[PDB]
Design a protein around this ligand. Structure first.
Ligand SMILES: CCC1=C(C)/C(=C/C2=NC(=C\c3[nH]c(/C=C4\NC(=O)[C@H](C)[C@H]4CC)c(C)c3CCC(=O)O)/C(CCC(=O)O)=C2C)NC1=O
Ligand SMILES: CCC1=C(C)/C(=C/C2=NC(=C\c3[nH]c(/C=C4\NC(=O)[C@H](C)[C@H]4CC)c(C)c3CCC(=O)O)/C(CCC(=O)O)=C2C)NC1=O
Ligand SMILES: CCC1=C(C)/C(=C/C2=NC(=C\c3[nH]c(/C=C4\NC(=O)[C@H](C)[C@H]4CC)c(C)c3CCC(=O)O)/C(CCC(=O)O)=C2C)NC1=O
Ligand SMILES: CCC1=C(C)/C(=C/C2=NC(=C\c3[nH]c(/C=C4\NC(=O)[C@H](C)[C@H]4CC)c(C)c3CCC(=O)O)/C(CCC(=O)O)=C2C)NC1=O
Ligand SMILES: CCC1=C(C)/C(=C/C2=NC(=C\c3[nH]c(/C=C4\NC(=O)[C@H](C)[C@H]4CC)c(C)c3CCC(=O)O)/C(CCC(=O)O)=C2C)NC1=O
Ligand SMILES: CCC1=C(C)/C(=C/C2=NC(=C\c3[nH]c(/C=C4\NC(=O)[C@H](C)[C@H]4CC)c(C)c3CCC(=O)O)/C(CCC(=O)O)=C2C)NC1=O
Ligand SMILES: CCC1=C(C)/C(=C/C2=NC(=C\c3[nH]c(/C=C4\NC(=O)[C@H](C)[C@H]4CC)c(C)c3CCC(=O)O)/C(CCC(=O)O)=C2C)NC1=O
Ligand SMILES: CCC1=C(C)/C(=C/C2=NC(=C\c3[nH]c(/C=C4\NC(=O)[C@H](C)[C@H]4CC)c(C)c3CCC(=O)O)/C(CCC(=O)O)=C2C)NC1=O
Ligand SMILES: CCC1=C(C)/C(=C/C2=NC(=C\c3[nH]c(/C=C4\NC(=O)[C@H](C)[C@H]4CC)c(C)c3CCC(=O)O)/C(CCC(=O)O)=C2C)NC1=O
Ligand SMILES: CCC1=C(C)/C(=C/C2=NC(=C\c3[nH]c(/C=C4\NC(=O)[C@H](C)[C@H]4CC)c(C)c3CCC(=O)O)/C(CCC(=O)O)=C2C)NC1=O
Ligand SMILES: CCC1=C(C)/C(=C/C2=NC(=C\c3[nH]c(/C=C4\NC(=O)[C@H](C)[C@H]4CC)c(C)c3CCC(=O)O)/C(CCC(=O)O)=C2C)NC1=O
Ligand SMILES: CCC1=C(C)/C(=C/C2=NC(=C\c3[nH]c(/C=C4\NC(=O)[C@H](C)[C@H]4CC)c(C)c3CCC(=O)O)/C(CCC(=O)O)=C2C)NC1=O
Lengths: 274, 172, 74, 162, 172, 162, 172, 162, 162
């Protein structure tokens, strides 16, 4: 039932389903009380298209809750290829650029900071780019200037929860997944009492940020490689965070901007207080 | 994040109580052995590079498949990632050792690896072997250092080992 | 020119132009060599909104650069 | 939970860095300081009962009207929940003493304090006066660096409430 | 950021030299007086709220124009900003006092501050006065605290004053 | 510049917070440890040069081809710039000892080290071997906590170069 | 960004005209010499590290003050920065050796330089000296390479020089 | 302004990188291609006059009604501004041919096209039909790779307008 | 993996754009250049055996001391792993030749190079000297644009190691 092979038999579109079952579907044949196996708390099964409506109806009745439906063939092509991003190409900005040096930087900051969503030409931050070109500001400010912009506020903040925002923030600004439940919490409390702007500053003035990017380096991916004071399970979070080269942050998804890192998963790396 | 005191405090609070005279003296003893603890953490910090290097040389001595094409420590990019992970784990083990709590180790970091590396297809037993190699050498250093006062560090050497063993178990 | 254009997309209320002697404590070329900077960025003029004024200053001092000036933006 | 140990570890981790002599020197402070801290802790622990009853009463003696009918120092339940609350504060003070930092106070009493007190119509003034009294009596249970420690944390609570 | 040692080091380095026996003993003395210094910083931290409050009550007692409409500490929003600035300055003065050097105060707080206030229309002379009142009360506390060992703290009281006086001068 | 004092102040500032008992305990560590640190500093200060000439030579004795013609341990200028460089390291070690942290080493030698050494064809191995030797001799100039301090910082440089 | 063709196009457009037969053949000639141009750019790329290194060795040979304490290429952090922007002038001059127009410099290198190095107190002539040395060595390489067909590259060597000379002039 | 040369330079700069064999190979394409491009350019340049009058007329022949009174193909000024506009397109086509990329078209005609045409009540259909006609006649002025180039850019404009 | 083809496609994709004449001109460069590249590739491929043994030896002849006992050019395993490593470089050079860009070199040898070499005590100087020698001999196996290509990539590796 778990992770599948193959698709169809006569022909179908296999969908794999996931639920949470009562002892009504599955119980042991024991002398007392009806219980399902504790590890099949959420169970998944792959069903071809016709049997599918009948299965969902049954599951819902006898008590289960469907958690997901997704085609099997989507889910057979693995996990993302990460070769482009295991070790990236660094893009920095020199004192006295040749101009198109500066052209390189802007295109990359865009891609990285905005998480590969398209920024259309009406959309670009032109006055701010003027500033970088004249020196005036360094490659750090545009990383900070873009983040406080409406375009950044609008595709990533306004329409999703704070859990999601912060998780995106780590990916964009720091290039790495969020290590602890404390990190999520520490941030949510800051936004709540100092506002959005103070909270944005907190990733860009951090010691972690400063070491790796310094001030003239565009933030680049770095979570597919071992880092310091990183729990070990933050390397699996990175797969959940980045979905491949053609994937992007996208707020235009049918289901909306949502999570990607399970809250249960974060707790595995440690729980304390505050 | 927890340390050994913070852990005591959380358990006391869950009773609604001031710390037990039991717990108080357990913590008085941790303060008693704290100079030794500082030397033990210092032993690791002061030889971090060699601990990783020596573990590494030996890992690939044993498992010459990792450095062939097709192998998970080939080409340079992957070897650098593997060397980096060795450092990351040695780092959090040293943090746990300063703290007296695997709350920055077992708690603050040993979970997804098993499934993730099994998914990445990375042989967990070999990864556990790398941690064992670091462990051997790290403890070597904890036990035989530069002009530290002579005494018994076996309690601390054990505790360091359990942090190395947590990591190994969690990953394999 | 960092001669602020308009409100420099800060929106907010007043605009303060703050200059700091930012370090190598902060910034740092992606280069292999020594968290430095590209001479020229010794003083960093920057325009912020009144709501975001306090947070920024706190993280400037916190990361070591020292404010050199402050003037209302207009 | 904020202690000297967790703070230096946090600062190392966030720079991807092994603990160095800067961080270990810091830790030695926390360990050298444990004796005074833990003496304060033991004295506050065994006197808890009376420190709490002393401070509870002092809240009524300084705010006489609280103990009249229709008021929040009247009836068994208010007066019971008061003793409990001061007891919570002393408890976390001892924890902060033992832990080597304000963490226990920050996480269990300071985070959220004002919102709670404001919804429940609890005046900080009472709590400050409970603590001012506890501070008066702890003057003769301790002295030297144990007293300084006790004071540090009592004062920390009073500033949290102002 | 500098502290009193770091300052010594920077001046030595500009000579290309190991620290002078002159400078060494100046720093040995700072270590000598460091318990007193910790009490002095602790005096401020332990009474921060009252120091700000008492300074405040007195500032508006003197300058009743600030709390009239038209005044820079009216309405609630502006008073909260003014109370906040009093705290910020008291905070960086305490940092300088732990450090034995004014630099954190000058670099993170005082640099640009006057020009900010003038842009805002905030009367700098009133702000200078609020700083003078914080100084009076802060030093009051440094000099008369809870069961500290009796001795002479005048050197430290002076140094704290110069940090308050730097801020005042810089702002007025 | 990283010292116990600057670290705790940085951590307070970044949370918009007065120094509290956690941070002052930390500072006491740094002040309590000054005596041992500064004894190490005085001993390393007065017994100084010869350490440089000893290590310089040892680089040539371990890499003989070094002191041969056409090589980088040959002629007055290379051998002069070598002594100078080891002297820079010992200088910053003493500074780090006196300062209470790695700051002086981090800011003046570690930041940029590899880029510089790589452009100028300077092998870290020499510098590690200079430092390993300095570590051998400092075994009999100091003992106890002054030696541990000296060691902490020498080892810190060796790890920076590996 | 402009190249030599784009420049032609902008000037034509400002007349409201299709390119003049004058301008057409000037550009036909650039295409004529383009293999040589590719070798010239390749000469710089293929020896970038040595060009910077050799310029550097010689800069500090001449100006031994920069590597003393007090000097702008001391300590490692600042020496690394020096090596980096020497790389900078080299690469931007090499990218210019391509467009047939200085604007990549007038728009950036010649723009704002008044409030740069000068603001910092960085001696521009010493930066220009490093630039001048990069020029000598870079052109050396453009003129004497690995098995390139023999011919005359002086036109391109001049043009490369003017890019080095633009940078020097702009900075000093 | 987008050309093969500017594109590879932009890509190098943005990775902080010298031009390498990948980028120089690219440039050789642009230089090898110049001959065909520039032949197309010369032919389009000298025939400009008639190519423009041919396409202008064809807009009226395909949209007969445009030339009636009260319409936008009537009177000297409309018909004058039309010839001019097609002339602008042919001009930028020749520029794009000479430049080795779409830059001149992107920067001077494509950026903003629809907003302008929409405010001024200019139908793209006319312009597509002007260009379709120009494409018909350029079939016999050129052949081989010069024709392919001319076509590439004419078609690029037609797609910009659909 | 960086090739002229992947680069232009990447640049199109990132602007949400079909490949246009700019990008196809670029591709023609890469295809026109394949003949010289692939001749270099075939010559480097069949001479691999001797190019590797030639460069390996030259590392020992230039650094004589490496071959003494206790050193890293001694014993079968060091000398075996050396030949292998130079063979890796030549292999990726041929790949970069065939691929039309530095991608194979960037992804399989450059990314991570210094970290690895630094942990394993491998001096770049050896590798530069291996490559300088390979460059000397490839002077008489090739000429014209195949030699220029071979050179481009050998030099690219030497700059990666400096
Ligand atoms: C593999 C061996 C194995 C284990 C360990 C197991 C655990 C298990 N405990 C269950 C229920 C339960 N377990 C408890 C246990 C407790 N309630 C409390 O309040 C206490 C804290 C705790 C007793 C110490 C209760 C009350 C339920 C019933 C929950 C319900 O139906 O509401 C169920 C659901 C099925 C059932 O009710 O029979 C499983 C599978 N099942 C297994 O096959
Ligand atoms: C607990 C009580 C209970 C319910 C409610 C239930 C629903 C249910 N409906 C099902 C199928 C189905 N249900 C329908 C129903 C419909 N098709 C339409 O187009 C209409 C909109 C709608 C009728 C109004 C169809 C067509 C299938 C077969 C789907 C397939 O196999 O392709 C299935 C899959 C198993 C099967 O086909 O027998 C379940 C479990 N099962 C249960 O045990
Ligand atoms: C809690 C302490 C901790 C551990 C243990 C840890 C493991 C870990 N290893 C990772 C990657 C990696 N790990 C390796 C390791 C190897 N490749 C091989 O071929 C060999 C078989 C093996 C070396 C022996 C490689 C190559 C990657 C990068 C995978 C990729 O991005 O494609 C990642 C993804 C994030 C990243 O790349 O930085 C994590 C989280 N992270 C942690 O925080
Ligand atoms: C800068 C941070 C810092 C460090 C590192 C520190 C170390 C330190 N280690 C000490 C003792 C010691 N340290 C050790 C350690 C060991 N004994 C062995 O035989 C083992 C090889 C090793 C096991 C870890 C022992 C046995 C003592 C003496 C007993 C004791 O004081 O507990 C002492 C007491 C003075 C002395 O006896 O020398 C100090 C101050 N103090 C500090 O402030
Ligand atoms: C916004 C991004 C940003 C930039 C660009 C920046 C530049 C910058 N360069 C500085 C110093 C410096 N910059 C250099 C650079 C050079 N010396 C030379 O001789 C060469 C010509 C050149 C290298 C190519 C040097 C030597 C100093 C130190 C000057 C001194 O302290 O004496 C400083 C003073 C603070 C510090 O030393 O850290 C700033 C702010 N800072 C920034 O935050
Ligand atoms: C873990 C740390 C912690 C603290 C500090 C805490 C305070 C606290 N005090 C409360 C109520 C209370 N607190 C008091 C306090 C007093 N009444 C008097 O006679 C005196 C005036 C005063 C004592 C000085 C009273 C009367 C209530 C009942 C309020 C109500 O529900 O109406 C409540 C509401 C929930 C409840 O009714 O218990 C909280 C959460 N809770 C916590 O979890
Ligand atoms: C780096 C640490 C730091 C300092 C020191 C700081 C000062 C500072 N004070 C401000 C405002 C203010 N400051 C005051 C202060 C006063 N009003 C009076 O009449 C009194 C004389 C005085 C109190 C003693 C007032 C009233 C405002 C609000 C002005 C307005 O918006 O009209 C502002 C504008 C942003 C804001 O309102 O939050 C800054 C940046 N900001 C910082 O980040
Ligand atoms: C938690 C951080 C921390 C603090 C706060 C600390 C304080 C501290 N203050 C001390 C002494 C003292 N502290 C003072 C301070 C004063 N004397 C006065 O009359 C003035 C009112 C006040 C001026 C500031 C004096 C006079 C001494 C005794 C002399 C000395 O030890 O230098 C001592 C030495 C033991 C003693 O004599 O009590 C300690 C440990 N130690 C620490 O680790
Ligand atoms: C503030 C801290 C600091 C350090 C550590 C430092 C290192 C340093 N060593 C250098 C050169 C050098 N370093 C050496 C080193 C040696 N030669 C030998 O005989 C031995 C093998 C070896 C000593 C172990 C040599 C020979 C040069 C000259 C390199 C050259 O210019 O060719 C240079 C280049 C500038 C110059 O030529 O002086 C720097 C920056 N610079 C600094 O500012
Ligand atoms: C991969 C990118 C790329 C490069 C680098 C390239 C080079 C290149 N250089 C060439 C010629 C040449 N290159 C030079 C260059 C020089 N002559 C000298 O004496 C000077 C030392 C040097 C000055 C720069 C000369 C003189 C010719 C022959 C004349 C010519 O074709 O213009 C040729 C024509 C074939 C030949 O005669 O060998 C090519 C293809 N082609 C390309 O696609
Ligand atoms: C640099 C590139 C560029 C282009 C392409 C361009 C198009 C353009 N065409 C315009 C007007 C016009 N365009 C036309 C076009 C036509 N009338 C006819 O007889 C035909 C139906 C058709 C030709 C096929 C007409 C009639 C106007 C006048 C519209 C008005 O102002 O009412 C205008 C308004 C400003 C003006 O009145 O001149 C612009 C900007 N402008 C530019 O700067
Ligand atoms: C895919 C591209 C790729 C490269 C380039 C590569 C280099 C490389 N060389 C290595 C070791 C080595 N490299 C050498 C090199 C040499 N010994 C000598 O006799 C000469 C001095 C020199 C040759 C010039 C030596 C001796 C070792 C063994 C180091 C050790 O484990 O101690 C290792 C460590 C793993 C192992 O022991 O095999 C790597 C990863 N690995 C790769 O995957």
């Amino acid at each position: 039932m778990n992770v599948l092979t193959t698709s169809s038999q006569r022909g179908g579109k296999l969908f794999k389903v996931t639920m949470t079952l009562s002892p009504a579907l599955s119980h042991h044949p024991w002398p007392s009380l009806d219980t399902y196996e504790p590890s099949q708390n959420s169970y998944s099964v792959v069903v071809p298209l016709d049997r599918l409506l009948a299965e969902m109806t049954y599951i819902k009745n006898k008590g289960g809750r469907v958690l997901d439906i997704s085609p099997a063939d989507l889910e057979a092509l693995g996990p993302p290829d990460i070769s482009s991003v295991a070790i990236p190409l660094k893009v920095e900005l020199w004192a006295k650029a040749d101009v198109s040096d500066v052209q390189a930087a802007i295109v990359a900051a865009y891609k990285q900071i905005f998480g590969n969503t398209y920024v259309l030409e009406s959309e670009r931050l032109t006055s701010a780019e003027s500033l970088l070109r004249n020196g005036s500001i360094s490659v750090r400010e545009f990383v900070r200037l873009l983040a406080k912009s409406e375009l950044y506020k609008e595709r990533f903040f306004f329409c999703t929860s704070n859990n999601r925002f912060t998780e995106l923030n780590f990916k964009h600004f720091l290039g790495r997944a969020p290590y602890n439940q404390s990190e999520i919490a520490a941030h949510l409390d800051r936004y709540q009492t100092f506002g959005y702007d103070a909270e944005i500053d907190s990733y860009i003035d951090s010691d972690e940020y400063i070491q790796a990017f310094g001030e003239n380096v565009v933030p680049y991916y770095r979570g597919f490689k071992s880092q310091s004071g990183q729990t070990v399970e933050s390397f699996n979070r990175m797969f959940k965070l980045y979905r491949g080269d053609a994937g992007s942050d996208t707020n235009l998804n049918l289901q909306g901007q949502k999570r990607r890192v399970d809250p249960k998963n974060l707790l595995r790396s440690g729980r304390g207080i505050v | 994040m927890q340390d050994a005191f913070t852990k005591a405090i959380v358990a006391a609070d869950l009773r609604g109580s001031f710390l037990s005279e039991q717990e108080l003296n357990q913590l008085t003893n941790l303060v008693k052995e704290s100079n030794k603890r500082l030397d033990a953490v210092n032993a690791i910090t002061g030889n971090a590079a060699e601990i990783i290097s020596d573990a590494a040389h030996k890992l690939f001595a044993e498992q010459t498949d990792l450095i062939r094409p097709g192998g998970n420590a080939y080409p340079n990019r992957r070897m650098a990632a593997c060397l980096r992970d060795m450092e990351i784990i040695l780092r959090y083990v040293s943090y746990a050792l300063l703290a007296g709590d695997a709350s920055v180790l077992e708690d603050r970091c040993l979970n997804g690896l098993k499934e993730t590396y099994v998914a990445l297809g990375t042989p967990t037993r070999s990864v556990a072997r790398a941690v064992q190699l670091m462990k051997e050498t790290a403890i070597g250093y904890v036990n035989s250092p530069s002009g530290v006062t002579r005494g018994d560090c076996s309690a601390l050497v054990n505790e360091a080992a359990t942090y190395f063993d947590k990591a190994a178990a969690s990953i394999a | 020119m960092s001669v602020l254009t308009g409100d420099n997309q800060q929106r907010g209320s007043k605009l303060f132009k703050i200059t700091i002697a930012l370090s190598p404590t902060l910034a740092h070329h992606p280069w292999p060599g020594l968290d430095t900077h590209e001479p020229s960025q010794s003083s960093y003029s920057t325009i912020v909104s009144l709501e975001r004024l306090l947070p920024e200053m706190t993280r400037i001092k916190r990361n070591g650069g020292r404010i050199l000036e402050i003037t209302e933006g207009e | 939970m904020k202690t000297v140990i967790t703070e230096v570890i946090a600062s190392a981790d966030s720079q991807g860095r092994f603990l160095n002599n800067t961080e270990l020197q810091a830790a030695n402070g926390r360990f050298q300081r444990a004796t005074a801290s833990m003496e304060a802790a033991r004295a506050l622990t065994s006197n808890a009962d009376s420190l709490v009853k002393g401070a509870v009463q002092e809240v009524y003696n300084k705010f006489p009207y609280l103990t009249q009918p229709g008021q929040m120092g009247y009836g068994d339940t208010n007066q019971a929940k008061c003793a409990r609350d001061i007891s919570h504060y002393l408890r976390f003070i001892t924890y902060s003493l033992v832990a080597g930092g304000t963490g226990p106070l920050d996480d269990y009493i300071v985070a959220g304090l004002r919102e709670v007190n404001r919804t429940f119509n609890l005046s900080p003034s009472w709590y400050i006066e409970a603590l001012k009294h506890i501070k008066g009596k702890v003057g003769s249970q301790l002295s030297g660096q144990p007293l300084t420690e006790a004071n540090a944390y009592i004062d920390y609570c009073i500033n949290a409430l102002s």
